[PDB]
Design an enzyme around this catalytic site. Structure first.
Site, PDB file in Angstrom:
ATOM      1  N   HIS A  43      52.990 -48.746  35.967  1.00  0.00           N
ATOM      2  CA  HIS A  43      53.377 -49.867  36.208  1.00  0.00           C
ATOM      3  C   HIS A  43      52.950 -50.342  37.423  1.00  0.00           C
ATOM      4  O   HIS A  43      52.848 -51.143  38.492  1.00  0.00           O
ATOM      5  CB  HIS A  43      54.328 -51.382  35.191  1.00  0.00           C
ATOM      6  CG  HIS A  43      55.548 -50.636  36.717  1.00  0.00           C
ATOM      7  ND1 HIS A  43      56.829 -50.374  35.707  1.00  0.00           N
ATOM      8  CD2 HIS A  43      55.888 -51.076  37.412  1.00  0.00           C
ATOM      9  CE1 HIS A  43      57.743 -50.996  37.002  1.00  0.00           C
ATOM     10  NE2 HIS A  43      57.652 -50.677  37.884  1.00  0.00           N
ATOM     11  N   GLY A 148      62.803 -52.984  43.063  1.00  0.00           N
ATOM     12  CA  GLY A 148      62.551 -51.472  43.516  1.00  0.00           C
ATOM     13  C   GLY A 148      63.086 -49.867  43.443  1.00  0.00           C
ATOM     14  O   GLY A 148      62.517 -49.006  43.839  1.00  0.00           O
ATOM     15  N   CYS A 150      62.314 -48.951  40.533  1.00  0.00           N
ATOM     16  CA  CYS A 150      61.702 -48.652  39.463  1.00  0.00           C
ATOM     17  C   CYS A 150      61.366 -46.756  39.692  1.00  0.00           C
ATOM     18  O   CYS A 150      60.934 -46.507  41.161  1.00  0.00           O
ATOM     19  CB  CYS A 150      60.200 -49.034  38.981  1.00  0.00           C
ATOM     20  SG  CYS A 150      60.811 -50.364  37.800  1.00  0.00           S
TER      21      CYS A 150
HETATM   22  C1  LIG Z   1      61.094 -52.297  39.181  1.00  0.00           C
HETATM   23  O1  LIG Z   1      61.956 -51.872  40.059  1.00  0.00           O
HETATM   24  C2  LIG Z   1      61.505 -52.588  38.575  1.00  0.00           C
HETATM   25  C3  LIG Z   1      63.259 -52.303  38.002  1.00  0.00           C
HETATM   26  C4  LIG Z   1      64.389 -53.672  38.071  1.00  0.00           C
HETATM   27  C5  LIG Z   1      63.879 -55.038  38.751  1.00  0.00           C
HETATM   28  C6  LIG Z   1      64.748 -56.023  38.735  1.00  0.00           C
HETATM   29  N1  LIG Z   1      66.186 -54.341  37.945  1.00  0.00           N
HETATM   30  C7  LIG Z   1      65.973 -53.784  37.627  1.00  0.00           C
HETATM   31  O2  LIG Z   1      66.156 -52.810  37.049  1.00  0.00           O
HETATM   32  N2  LIG Z   1      60.970 -53.659  36.785  1.00  0.00           N
HETATM   33  C8  LIG Z   1      61.181 -54.573  36.589  1.00  0.00           C
HETATM   34  O3  LIG Z   1      60.188 -55.633  37.420  1.00  0.00           O
HETATM   35  C9  LIG Z   1      60.223 -54.820  35.388  1.00  0.00           C
HETATM   36  C10 LIG Z   1      58.179 -54.777  35.336  1.00  0.00           C
HETATM   37  C11 LIG Z   1      57.847 -54.714  33.975  1.00  0.00           C
HETATM   38  C12 LIG Z   1      58.679 -53.371  33.395  1.00  0.00           C
HETATM   39  C13 LIG Z   1      56.566 -54.430  33.554  1.00  0.00           C
HETATM   40  N3  LIG Z   1      60.125 -55.842  34.082  1.00  0.00           N
HETATM   41  C14 LIG Z   1      61.501 -56.781  34.703  1.00  0.00           C
HETATM   42  O4  LIG Z   1      62.667 -55.444  34.365  1.00  0.00           O
HETATM   43  O5  LIG Z   1      61.612 -57.395  34.697  1.00  0.00           O
HETATM   44  C15 LIG Z   1      63.212 -57.734  34.064  1.00  0.00           C
HETATM   45  C16 LIG Z   1      62.107 -60.298  33.632  1.00  0.00           C
HETATM   46  C17 LIG Z   1      62.373 -59.586  32.578  1.00  0.00           C
HETATM   47  C18 LIG Z   1      62.301 -61.471  32.778  1.00  0.00           C
HETATM   48  C19 LIG Z   1      61.381 -61.570  33.471  1.00  0.00           C
HETATM   49  O6  LIG Z   1      60.740 -62.255  33.844  1.00  0.00           O
HETATM   50  N4  LIG Z   1      61.745 -60.126  34.197  1.00  0.00           N
HETATM   51  C20 LIG Z   1      61.405 -59.766  35.836  1.00  0.00           C
HETATM   52  C21 LIG Z   1      61.884 -60.779  37.298  1.00  0.00           C
HETATM   53  C22 LIG Z   1      62.923 -59.323  37.257  1.00  0.00           C
HETATM   54  C23 LIG Z   1      62.524 -59.111  38.970  1.00  0.00           C
HETATM   55  C24 LIG Z   1      62.988 -60.026  39.733  1.00  0.00           C
HETATM   56  C25 LIG Z   1      61.442 -60.701  39.468  1.00  0.00           C
HETATM   57  C26 LIG Z   1      60.714 -60.494  38.675  1.00  0.00           C
HETATM   58  C27 LIG Z   1      60.982 -58.672  37.825  1.00  0.00           C
END
Ligand SMILES: *[C@H](O)[C@H](C[C@@H]1CCNC1=O)NC(=O)[C@H](CC(C)C)NC(=O)OC[C@@H]1CCC(=O)N1C[C@H]1C[C@@H]2CC[C@H]1C2
Ligand SMILES: *[C@H](O)[C@H](C[C@@H]1CCNC1=O)NC(=O)[C@H](CC(C)C)NC(=O)OC[C@@H]1CCC(=O)N1C[C@H]1C[C@@H]2CC[C@H]1C2
Lengths: 306, 305
Positions: A43, A148, A150
C-alpha cells in the site's frame, strides 16, 4: 517471589542493519533490505485518498523502477537504486542494484497461533523500539504501532539464523494489529484496504497456559496442582466449548513436565478448575490465566534450556 | 437440474514438467524442480526404521551432495547432478547444476482454510492423477495419497503464475492428509515424524456453505430463502457454538449477492435453520450442507466469470 519471566526480545542489531525507508510518490513507510531485495507493504503505492478500494494490480502496472526511492538512514547511509519491482500478495518485492553487506543468515517462515516473536518497530526507516508478541488464535497481535510503522518487521532467531515472519500492515478496530508473512499473505482473513473488517474471536492459548503453570511450579508455587488428571483428548473436547485452543504437546512442554515431575494432564485438569475462578488466590501475581508465555520462553528463561 | 458444479482442477501440464524423483539411500519420493532448486520432504533422508523420532539436523550433516539422486522421467528425461543441499523447516532444498528449462512463472504462498487448490499426485517422480481439495479448518485436506506420494504438490494459478502452496507429507489417523508450505512449515500443528499426533477438530467452512447456497439460488432452487437475516456478528457467535468457521465476506461472495439479489445475511439465517435439518427436502441433490465449493468456484463455473 518474582517468577524470573519477562517479555524478552531477541537483540535487534542484526535486523536494525536491514531496515530502510521506502517512498513511492507521496507515500512512505519501512522496508527490509536483504541480499538484492527490498520488501515493503504494497500500500505504499496507494494514494492516500484511495486506500479504501485500491486496485493494486493497476497501481503496480503504473509504476516503473524510478517510482521508488529506498534510503538507508542508520549506520552507513545509502540510497539504493531500484532495478526491478514485483508484487507478491500484499508485499512489494523491489530489486536493488546493491546487495546488503549486512545481510544476516535468514529464512522466511509463517508464525502459528500461540508462538512468540520479536518486533522491531520503525518509523521513516529508523528503528525506535523492540517488543515481543504472541500471534493470537485470531491472527492478530497486541502490539504498539502508530502511523508510519507499516513495514516494521517481526522475527525469531534459531542460532544465528533470523527467521522473518511478519511485516506490519494495519490496526484493527479493537486496537490489535496484523500484517503479512513474507510470502505476501496476510495473517488471518484480513485485507490490506482501509475499511472496517470482521475480526474473529480470540481464544486462550492452552499450550501457553500450561507453560505458565509450569513456570509457577518451577518457582515454588503449586497450590493448584492436584493428583487429578484430564486427558488431552478430554481436555480438547472441553476446550472447544470454553474458548480455549486445543492443546498439542511438544518436546518443550515435555521437558517442563520432566523437570517438575508434574504431568501435563494434571495441569489440563488445573486449567479447567482455575477457569472457573482462582478462589481469591494468586498464581505468579495474577488472578487470571496467562497465555502470553510459551513453553520455549519458560524453558529458556528459567532453566536456560535453548 | 444439474447445477454445473464439479470439482475442477487446473490443467496440470505446467506442473508435471517440474516433477522429479528424489532418492536418498533406500528411501524415494517426489520433488519439485524450479530454477536450480529441487524441493522435497526432508524425511527422504530418514531410514525407514527411524521415522518415529528423526534427528534431522544430524541426518542433514551426515549427507553429502552424492547422497541424493534426482531424476526427471517424463518428457525429456534427465539424471540431475546435485551440487548443494540445505534444509528449510520440513523440506530439503537441493541445488542442481541445471536450471529447469520448463520452470513456469511461479510464487510460493500459504493456502488458508476454506480455499481450494489443485494437487498433482505423483509416484516415483511420475504424475499419476490430479484432483482439487479445500484446506480444512483443522489444516488437513481430504486427499487421495498412497505410499510413495510424498512430495506431490498442490498449487493454484493466477493468470500464468503458478502459486505453489502444498507439498505432501503424511496421512493422519482419520484418513485425511497434510503437508508443508514451501517455507518449510507444516500446515497446522503437525510434525513430520511417525508418531501419534493430536488431530484438531474440523469445522464447516461457512463462507463455502454460503457460496453453495448461492449456487442453489442461481440454479432456481431457492425454497430456503426468507426475509429473515442474521448479521455477520451474530452468525459468528453462533458459529463458534456450532462447529462452523466464522464468516468473513469477500468480493467474490459479494458478486454472488449482487447477482442473485439475496443478501449474505439472509443466507446466514438460512444456514442456522438448515443446520438443524433439511425437513426432508434437498438442496442441489443433497440433504446436508456442502462446504467443498468456494465462492470463486461458483462465480467461474456457474456465472462464467
Ligand atoms: C501503516 O503505517 C499503518 C499502520 C497503522 C496506523 C495506526 N496504527 C497502525 O498499526 N496502516 C494503516 O494505516 C492501514 C492502511 C491500509 C491497510 C491500507 N489502515 C489501518 O490500519 O486502518 C485502521 C483504521 C480502520 C478504520 C480506519 O479508518 N482506519 C484508518 C485510520 C487509522 C490511522 C490514522 C488515520 C487512518 C490511518
Ligand atoms: C510419504 O510418501 C508418506 C505418505 C503417506 C503414506 C500413506 N499415505 C500417505 O499420505 N508419508 C509417510 O509415510 C509419513 C512419514 C512421516 C511424516 C515421517 N507417515 C505417515 O503418513 O504415516 C501414516 C500412518 C497411517 C495412517 C496414520 O495415521 N499414520 C500415522 C501413524 C503414526 C501414529 C501411530 C499410528 C498412526 C498414528
Amino acid at each position: 517471589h518474582h517468577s524470573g519471566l519477562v517479555k524478552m526480545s531477541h537483540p535487534s542489531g542484526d535486523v536494525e542493519a536491514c531496515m530502510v525507508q521506502v517512498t513511492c510518490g507521496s507515500m512512505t513507510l519501512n522496508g527490509l533490505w536483504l541480499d538484492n531485495t527490498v520488501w515493503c507493504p504494497r500500500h505504499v503505492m496507494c494514494p492516500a485518498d484511495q486506500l479504501s478500494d485500491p486496485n493494486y494490480d493497476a497501481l503496480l502496472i503504473s509504476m516503473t523502477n524510478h517510482s521508488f526511492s529506498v534510503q538507508k538512514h542508520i549506520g552507513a547511509p545509502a540510497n539504493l537504486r531500484v532495478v526491478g519491482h514485483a508484487m507478491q500478495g500484499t508485499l512489494l518485492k523491489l530489486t536493488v542494484d546493491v546487495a546488503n553487506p549486512s545481510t544476516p543468515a535468514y529464512t522466511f517462515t509463517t508464525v502459528k497461533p500461540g508462538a512468540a516473536f520479536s518486533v522491531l518497530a520503525c518509523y521513516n526507516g529508523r528503528p525506535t523500539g523492540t517488543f515481543t508478541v504472541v500471534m493470537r488464535p485470531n491472527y492478530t497481535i497486541k502490539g504498539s504501532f502508530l502511523c508510519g510503522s507499516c513495514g516494521s518487521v517481526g522475527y525469531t532467531k534459531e542460532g544465528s539464523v533470523i527467521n522473518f515472519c511478519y511485516m506490519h500492515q494495519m490496526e484493527l478496530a479493537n486496537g490489535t494489529h496484523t500484517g503479512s508473512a513474507f510470502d505476501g499473505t496476510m495473517y488471518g482473513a484480513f485485507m490490506d484496504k482501509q475499511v472496517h473488517q470482521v475480526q474473529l474471536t480470540d481464544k486462550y492459548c492452552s499450550v501457553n497456559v500450561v507453560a505458565w503453570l509450569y513456570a509457577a511450579i518451577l518457582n515454588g508455587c503449586a497450590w493448584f496442582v492436584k493428583p487429578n488428571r484430564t486427558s488431552v483428548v478430554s481436555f480438547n473436547e472441553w476446550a472447544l466449548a470454553n474458548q480455549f485452543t486445543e492443546f498439542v504437546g511438544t518436546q518443550s512442554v515435555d521437558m517442563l513436565a520432566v523437570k517438575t515431575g508434574v504431568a501435563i494432564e494434571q495441569l489440563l485438569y488445573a486449567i479447567q478448575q482455575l477457569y472457573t475462578g482462582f478462589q481469591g488466590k494468586q498464581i505468579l501475581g495474577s488472578t487470571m490465566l496467562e497465555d502470553e508465555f510459551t513453553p520455549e520462553d519458560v524453558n529458556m528463561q528459567i532453566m536456560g534450556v535453548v
